Structure 1
Amino acid sequence: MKVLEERNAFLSDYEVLKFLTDLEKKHLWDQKSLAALKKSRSKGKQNRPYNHPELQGITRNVVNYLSINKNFINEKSGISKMSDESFAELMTKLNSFKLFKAEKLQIVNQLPANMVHLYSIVEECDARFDEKTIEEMLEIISGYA
């Protein structure tokens, strides 16, 4: 074992969510597959899936944490309710705006619905922005695209 580099790139939560759900689909681990084969009826095809308990725990936990909504309301994340073209649209929208890579990552990872959340993510917003930019942040993020 030898870590060539600590960081090779960045991954948005859409990337990890899509990769993990593709892993569930390929390994037959989703709630649909288990509720169709192991539950709700007896197995006749005997379609045993890939077996890895630690990977079960970690992937199930991560997909549950990314599926649930974030700290913006007191029902789902919205990342699970948006596609690749919506992500492309969102980054084409966000590229022209005065944001850094880390800030764009954080706002696409969390998708704020609250004004105070947006001022929490970006640093010294009043020293860079004016009120119309914050407003337009709110409708571009609220559209989930």
Structure 2
Amino acid sequence: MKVLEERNAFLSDYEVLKFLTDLEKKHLWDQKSLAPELQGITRNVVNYLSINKNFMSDESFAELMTKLNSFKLFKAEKLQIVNQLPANMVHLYSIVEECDARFDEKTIEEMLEIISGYA
């Protein structure tokens, strides 16, 4: 069918779980009321998402911008560090190009301590 554009404003994964909780809330809302063919993506999303950060929040996300602003890492890395491999050494070395590079000794460790200030 007709497409009006390639890609709109970039949407990472946070509010997915949040607004699929609305899709949840509407139809049967799963595990609670337990006591079509939308179940394919439904059970799939919430499972993969939530299981990661367990073994989320409301405000501190919007307040995580502070030092995430002053850092020049731009976009592709920005919404990526939200989930994968928080706060240890060579972890974040994989995602962002020129990770060590320019500023090294202290300033990047400031990333580690704050993303460890997540949980």
Fold equivalence (TM over 0.5): yes
User: Is the radius of gyration larger for structure 1 or structure 2?
Assistant: 1
Unaligned runs of 5+ in 2: none
Q: Structure 1 or 2: larger strand share?
A: 1
Aligned partners of 1:70 and 1:110 also within 8 Å: no
- Cα–Cα, structure 1 residues 16 and 3, in superposed 2: closer, same or farther, change >3 Å? same
SS of the equivalent of 2:76 reads helix
Aligned partners of 2:77 and 2:95 also within 8 Å: yes
**Larger RCO (CA under 8 A, 6+ residues apart):** 1
Aligned partners of 2:17 and 2:46 also within 8 Å: yes
- Cα–Cα, structure 1 residues 101 and 91, in superposed 2: closer, same or farther, change >3 Å? same
- Cα–Cα, structure 1 residues 69 and 106, in superposed 2: closer, same or farther, change >3 Å? same
Q: Structure 1 or 2: larger helix share?
A: 1
Alpha-carbon shift at residue 59 of structure 1 (Å): 1.7
Alpha-carbon shift at residue 70 of structure 1 (Å): 6.6
Aligned partners of 1:12 and 1:109 also within 8 Å: no
- Cα–Cα, structure 1 residues 5 and 86, in superposed 2: closer, same or farther, change >3 Å? same
Aligned partners of 1:119 and 1:125 also within 8 Å: yes
The percentage of aligned residue pairs carrying the same residue is 100
Q: CA RMSD in A?
A: 2.3
Alpha-carbon shift at residue 131 of structure 1 (Å): 2.4
